[PDB]
Amino acid sequence: MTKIALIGSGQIGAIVGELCLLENLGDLILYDVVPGIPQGKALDLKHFSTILGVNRNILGTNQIEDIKDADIIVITAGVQRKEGMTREDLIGVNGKIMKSVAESVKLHCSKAFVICVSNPLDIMVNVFHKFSNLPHEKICGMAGILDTSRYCSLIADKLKVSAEDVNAVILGGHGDLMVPLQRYTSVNGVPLSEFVKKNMISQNEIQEIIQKTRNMGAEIIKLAKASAAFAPAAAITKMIKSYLYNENNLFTCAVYLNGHYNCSNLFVGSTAKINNKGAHPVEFPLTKEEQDLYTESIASVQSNTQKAFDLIK
Amino acid sequence: MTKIALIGSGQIGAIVGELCLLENLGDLILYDVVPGIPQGKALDLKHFSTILGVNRNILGTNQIEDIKDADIIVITAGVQRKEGMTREDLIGVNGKIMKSVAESVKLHCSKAFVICVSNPLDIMVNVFHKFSNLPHEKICGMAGILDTSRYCSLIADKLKVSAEDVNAVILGGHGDLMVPLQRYTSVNGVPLSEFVKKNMISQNEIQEIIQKTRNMGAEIIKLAKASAAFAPAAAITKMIKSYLYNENNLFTCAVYLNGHYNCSNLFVGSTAKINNKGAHPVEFPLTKEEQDLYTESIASVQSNTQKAFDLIK
Amino acid sequence: MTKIALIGSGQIGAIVGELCLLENLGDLILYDVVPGIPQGKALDLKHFSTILGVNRNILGTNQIEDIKDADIIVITAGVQRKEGMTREDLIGVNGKIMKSVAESVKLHCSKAFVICVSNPLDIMVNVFHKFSNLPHEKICGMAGILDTSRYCSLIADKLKVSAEDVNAVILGGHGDLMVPLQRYTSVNGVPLSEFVKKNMISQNEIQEIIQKTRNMGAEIIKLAKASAAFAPAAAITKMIKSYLYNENNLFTCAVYLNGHYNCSNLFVGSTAKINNKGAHPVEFPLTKEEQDLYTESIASVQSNTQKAFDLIK
């Protein structure tokens, strides 16, 4: 009975649709602006479903009114960045597309939980909120779970351990001003600081890893000649799952801050729980230096969000 | 008989129109997309003309077909940057506007000489060339004359001399990668190097001046809460005069390079002569270090020009 | 050595400063209440000066004490009217600002010649006189030259002649009660009445022109979405020139009447000469009907001037 609507049928959207079919999360509605594309991917996904014994319904469509009564909405519509571009270079073109999608969600399914993915991520979440007229808890963007997977993946490689239980918090905008927290990084419970004391990893090796985590999005674009698709989709699916199954998991994602971390009235990457009712920020006690870094990231997201609103007229 | 068409009736356009009326350079056509604005400024400029005894014709219009048979075209249409923004942040919105203007010039007056001013300058000149179908010598952008005026103005102040005969060459993009050439700076003929030997100015004071020249555009935006208008207009007028009167003056402006300075197929800030036939680059013998700096500037302009073409689809 | 102080660094002030630099009339002191604005315009004006080979000094300031020893003072401080407003609607807010400026001039440079421009013009001149404690010949307001340029410009267009030597007298307040004098309108010496006899223009066409001249201020505001700036500045610059160069030109401007045209103890738009010693009214022989119209205008100015003094407590 659950309806999952994918607004954008590119790489990310299709793979999210694939993962949702693998876990039987819901019926799919594959939407795109380009005719034929969603209908063809929906065909391929039905045949996939038949081979793997999944039976959920899949509809490919160019009529956005088919999004009605979606429980979940995943928004990937928009242009992706090429080599040499920043995520912020898409601000003009994607802001306008995000506004249009917002307007469509507004009239067709105002009760949905909305996961935004178009870049630059944090900025586009703010745009969607502005024109959608949905409650702020019902809107978020995925980024932190991707950046955290990259940072944890690198930490795990340097320590010669499974990535499976390396956890971390990364705060801030999905961009160069991310703030990975060493204090909030653990290996099956054991703080990262214990591995520095044991000389298994050095403060310089960690700064290196933080730099690679920042540039990772660009590095994949350079190498693969396309932006990351699989990890983003997995991250999104994890947020969907936490919402549908009321799991109340604690992630980093772009969420409405409201007095948390000395910030108010902005969507930005932060620690949050996701459940039945949506995405809810949680404030943890930062050091001065940590909060300073986080505020600096918040400031960019503030500026660029204003820039985005301005360029929409 | 000469027709001067101002595509854009903001600050810069109006002042250009004013300066053109002061020197009797031609009849004006004031064009803008926004209804009423050009017609009102035209009324003001008529009254100004009556007080100062200038008698040229002035037409304010929203019909871009009135640009027919313009001998000169000055393009200021586009958005200006606000505090905190770079010129490059306008790339998305202005590239689209510049293309549209290009298309209009193409069908309505293909024989005009075209001075582009919309930011980011060098990049927007390349866009205009691409979609206008005009010869490359008939297109340029003003920037170097403005940057030079700033640099020369600061040099003059430090040396306690008249700015009147302080001349200089600044190569490269109108941006943070400008290359002011100390070797090609003189004070009524006397090279700048003579003033360093005489201890009237130091190498550090010069580097300070170069930095202020680079940031000057932003510094005026911060202070005046609007971008510079008088100096840009005067620089534009100087280039118009050099074309109309066949003066063959040697400026820096954004010009088609074609094997000059190891660069081909790009409009970028360079040394050029302007006459009856348009803007013609001239190559001077640079040192390795000078050319290295210039090539680095050229590279940005290359990248960002590609970016601009990409974002136009 | 001449110092010209612009009290108010908006559109008009800056353009006045521009025109003063073009003719080398004096060093500029750009004052405004708003921090940064004059300093930024002064930068732009220096760079303008450098391109055009002008070398006068230009100081942007928020310290009104920098107005000391100004030979000339131009006052544009104040709020401008928007669409649908009359000039008289500013009476409350501008009267207070004018008083403050008066007080500052009083203590910092009592020997200056003062050209007031804030609206409603005639009323604000009277306010400045009251609180400034300067001789009445050393104070005037520009308006007539602007209204005359408009009327002459329209008469020139209808007669298919150069505006260059169409001259006219317009008496009275800068407002709906202007009194253009047909009898005192000539085309290179030839009275307007000769062109009516020759059927080149009709009495109705003239009344039409007079109506457009009255509404012209509002018509620009409507079309350009801002009030006229180039023509007001040129008028101002003309009055500056006539004072500095002792020209003894005969204009219409707001001047202290003292038994002239049956009026005493009021600044109001009238025929005057400007020279070294200030603005001096001159009475010409009016007809009964002309004088009646003029007295009616003078009455409004009287009333509204009283209103202004009242609203200042």
Which residue among B36, B220, B228 sits closest to C222, beta carbon to beta carbon? B36
Nearest to A243 by CA among A59, A111, A143: A111
Sheet with A166-171: strands ordered across: A166-171, A179-187, A190-191
Sequence length of chain C is: 313
A12 is in an annotated binding site: yes
User: Do the bridges between strand B190-191 and strand B179-187 make them parallel or antiparallel, or are there none, so unpaired?
Assistant: antiparallel
* φ, ψ for residue A150, nearest 5 deg: -70, -55
**A94, A86 contact by CB (below 8 A):** no
Calpha distance A239→A248 (Å, rounded): 10
Cβ <8 Å between C231 and B44: yes
* φ, ψ for residue C278, nearest 5 deg: 125, -155
Residues of B in contact with C230 (CB under 8 A): 14, 18, 41, 44-45, 47-48
Cα C205 to chain centroid, rounded: 27
Cα A312 to chain centroid, rounded: 23
Residues of A in contact with B97 (CB under 8 A): none
Residues of C in contact with B152 (CB under 8 A): 50
Calpha distance C79→C82 (Å, rounded): 10
Angle (CA) B31 B36 B41, round 5°: 65
Sole residue written with tokens 């603005």? C279
Question: Residue C233: enclosing H or E segment and its boundaries?
Answer: helix C230-244
Residue C311 near chain B (CB below 8 Å):
no
Nearest to B173 by CA among B312, B311, B309, B294: B294
Residues of C in contact with B227 (CB under 8 A): none
User: What is the separation, in whole angstroms, between the first and last Cα of chain A?
Assistant: 40
CB atoms within 10 A of CB C306: 12
CA distances (Å), origin A191, targets A55, A149, A195: 43, 17, 8
Fold of B1-143: Rossmann fold (3.40.50)
Which residue among A82, A303, A310 sits closest to B310, beta carbon to beta carbon? A82
Calpha distance A300→A297 (Å, rounded): 5
**A286, A294 contact by CB (below 8 A):** yes
Nearest to C79 by CA among C132, C6, C10, C173: C10
| B94 Cα to chain A: minimum distance (Å) | 10
Calpha distance A133→B165 (Å, rounded): 61
Sheet with A72-75: strands ordered across: A58-61, A27-31, A3-7, A72-75, A113-116, A139-141, A249-260, A263-275, A278-281
Asked how this structure was determined, the answer is X-ray
DSSP 8-state class, residue B35: T
Nearest CA in chain B to C220: B40
Positions of C annotated as catalytic residues are: 174
Of chain C residues 6-25, which have a CB less than 8 A from chain B?
A: 14-15, 18, 22
Residues of A in contact with B303 (CB under 8 A): 84
The token pair that represents A97 in the structure block: 């597309």
A87 is in an annotated binding site: yes
CB atoms within 10 A of CB C202: 12
Nearest to C297 by CA among C213, C183, C174: C174
| A309 Cα to chain B: minimum distance (Å) | 13
Q: Where are the alpha helices (DSSP H) in chain B?
A: 11-22, 37-52, 91-108, 121-132, 144-159, 192-197, 203-224, 230-244, 288-311
Question: Residue A16: enclosing H or E segment and its boundaries?
Answer: helix A11-22
> DSSP assignment of C46-88, as one string?
HHHHHHHT----EEEES-GGGGTT-SEEEE--SPPP-TT--GG
Q: What is the CATH number of domain C144-313?
A: 3.90.110.10
Q: In a 3-state reduction of DSSP, which class is residue A232? A: helix
Of chain A residues 70-99, which have a CB less than 8 A from chain B?
A: 82, 84-85, 89, 91-93
Residue A307 near chain B (CB below 8 Å):
yes
**A71, A113 contact by CB (below 8 A):** yes
At position B222, the amino acid (one-letter code) is: K
Resolution to 1 decimal place, in Å: 2.4
Which residues make up the CATH 3.40.50.720 domain(s) of chain A?
1-143
Catalytic residue among A47, A129, A136, A174: A174
Residues B267, B272, B275, B279: what is their CA dihedral angle, to the nearest 10 degrees? -10
CA distances (Å), origin B224, targets B149, B215, C32, C113: 19, 14, 11, 28
Nearest to B134 by CA among B30, B278, B305, B303: B278
CA distances (Å), origin A39, targets A29, A60, A97, A167, C183: 10, 4, 21, 39, 83
C32 is in an annotated binding site: yes
